[PDB]
Design a binder for this molecule. Structure first.
Ligand SMILES: [Cl-]
Ligand SMILES: [Cl-]
Ligand SMILES: [Mg+2]
Ligand SMILES: [Mg+2]
Ligand code: NA
Ligand code: NA
Ligand code: NA
Ligand code: NA
Ligand SMILES: [Zn+2]
Ligand SMILES: [Zn+2]
Ligand SMILES: [Zn+2]
Ligand SMILES: [Zn+2]
Ligand SMILES: [Zn+2]
Ligand SMILES: [Zn+2]
Ligand SMILES: [Zn+2]
Ligand SMILES: [Zn+2]
Ligand SMILES: [Zn+2]
Ligand SMILES: [Zn+2]
Lengths: 102, 102
């Protein structure tokens, strides 16, 4: 994700929505914190059990911290169990559907 | 869109993000207001020229009014020129990508 980005907020207390100029990302808050804790601790089970879970409301500051750290991860793509940390949609798919150039 | 829904906000001063339990919708603010004005005025060119444009910030109240009216339109799907008023993504596509049931 580009270094210029806009955090749109939380959805279903499970995803953080953040976009750059190319994609809208839906970042799984649990998988992201698990990856953060795994890269620090090198222990998959410990990283999992201490991380936030889906269904927890997160503050705006906590969300900023997580997204900032996400960009610096060695593996921002998949959690230690191999699940994708996020879903992304190209912004052009949204714009093109309504007939707009992007 | 179901009558229970959550407005997530504006994106790129062009789309309103709103979801129900099934889809996340990206509603083109211009195409929506144009459809609203067209159903009232029955004049495509007048409805277009008086409607909000992309690139305009909208207040939270204006966004609420538009989304409320959208659900009551005779044609909430396409503007009078035939463009889709919105893009939608099934929430299950987002959840499934990160390995979650939905
Ligand atoms: Cl979880
Ligand atoms: Cl426009
Ligand atoms: Mg252990
Ligand atoms: Mg006319
Ligand atoms: Na940048
Ligand atoms: Na919600
Ligand atoms: Na409902
Ligand atoms: Na923006
Ligand atoms: Zn676990
Ligand atoms: Zn886990
Ligand atoms: Zn901070
Ligand atoms: Zn995992
Ligand atoms: Zn395409
Ligand atoms: Zn026109
Ligand atoms: Zn128009
Ligand atoms: Zn109102
Ligand atoms: Zn139109
Ligand atoms: Zn699918």
């Amino acid at each position: 994700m580009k270094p210029t980005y806009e955090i749109l907020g939380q959805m279903d207390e499970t995803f953080i929505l953040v976009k750059d100029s190319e994609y809208l990302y839906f970042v799984d808050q649990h998988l992201l914190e698990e990856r953060i804790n795994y890269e620090k601790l090198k222990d998959e089970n410990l990283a999992c059990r201490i991380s936030v879970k889906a269904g927890q409301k997160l503050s705006e500051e906590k969300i900023r911290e997580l997204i900032k750290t996400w960009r610096n991860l060695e593996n921002p793509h998949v959690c230690p169990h191999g699940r994708p940390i996020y879903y992304k949609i190209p912004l052009r798919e949204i714009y093109e559907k309504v007939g707009r150039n992007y």
